[PDB]
Amino acid sequence: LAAGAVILRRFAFNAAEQLIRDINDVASQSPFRQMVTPGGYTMSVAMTNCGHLGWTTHRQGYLYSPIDPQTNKPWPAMPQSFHNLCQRAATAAGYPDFQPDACLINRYAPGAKLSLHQDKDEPDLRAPIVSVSLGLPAIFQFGGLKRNDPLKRLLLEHGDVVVWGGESRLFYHGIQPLKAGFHPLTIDCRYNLTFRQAG
Ligand SMILES: O=C(O)CCC(=O)C(=O)O
Ligand SMILES: [Fe+3]
């Protein structure tokens, strides 16, 4: 559907329960927080990070920081389940040398959305982003290299993994307002993990 993207549906289905337990452990150290955009709007999506570097708004802009500005401590270490899952998915997609040093964790409550954006804050744009979906289904939308490219829509469900490589690495993308529902593991939300090579 997208040049350079590898969709691995249900790839993390068996690992989901451990991933969610580790999400909670990470969040007990660096809690979920709704960040303020450089434009002054509070994001409806709640976020936190783990790894060497964490994506965060700071000084009226986006940056990767080794410190959590809400705790003044380093981000929690990347759990084993995260590292193992990401390496397995990257290798299967043909990126065996991908070594993420940052994982952004998004939490979507009903009604939460992520507006169209690009992920180009990383110094090496040749490296892929590995995306892991957990919990309630979400409508993922993506266009192309331009704001104005026509959008394609794809449902992402519990356990789906996408490796955004090549051209797709630079596409505009976002998430439509999450529909309320029930999931036996996450109850009433969706989690998304995006593994990044940000160093
Ligand atoms: O929630 C998703 O599936 C996409 C998340 C995303 O694009 C991001 O956090 O950069
Ligand atoms: Fe993104």
Pick from 108, 131, 190, 193 the residue to mutate for probing ligand 1's pocket: most ligand atoms within 8 Å of its CB. Answer: 131
**Reduced to 3 states, what is the DSSP secondary structure of residue 142?**
strand
Q: What is the DSSP string of the chain?
A: --TTEEEETTTTTTTHHHHHHHHHHHHHHS--B-PBPTTSPBPSSEEEEEES-EEEE-SSSEEEESEETTTTEEPPPPPHHHHHHHHHHHHHTT-TT----EEEEEEE-TT--EEEE----SS-TTS-EEEEEEES-EEEEE--SSTTSPPEEEEE-TT-EEEE-GGGGG--EEEPPPPP--BTTTBS-EEEEEEE---
Domain that holds residue 171: 1-199
What span, in angstroms and rounded, lies between the C-alpha atoms of 51 and 127?
17
Q: Residue 46 C-alpha to ligand 1 middle, in angstroms?
A: 11
Resolution reached, in Å?
A: 2.1
173 lines ligand 1 (CB under 6 A): yes
What span, in angstroms and rounded, lies between the C-alpha atoms of 53 and 48?
11
Q: Residue 74 C-alpha to ligand 1 middle, in angstroms?
A: 22
Q: Is 108 annotated as a binding residue?
A: yes
Q: By the 8 A CB rule, do 129 and 96 touch?
A: no
Q: Is 64 annotated as a binding residue?
A: yes
Q: By the 8 A CB rule, do 172 and 117 touch?
A: yes
106 lines ligand 1 (CB under 6 A): yes
Domain count for the chain, please give it.
1
Instruction: Please tell me the experimental approach by which this structure was elucidated.
Output: X-ray
Q: Is 25 annotated as a binding residue?
A: no
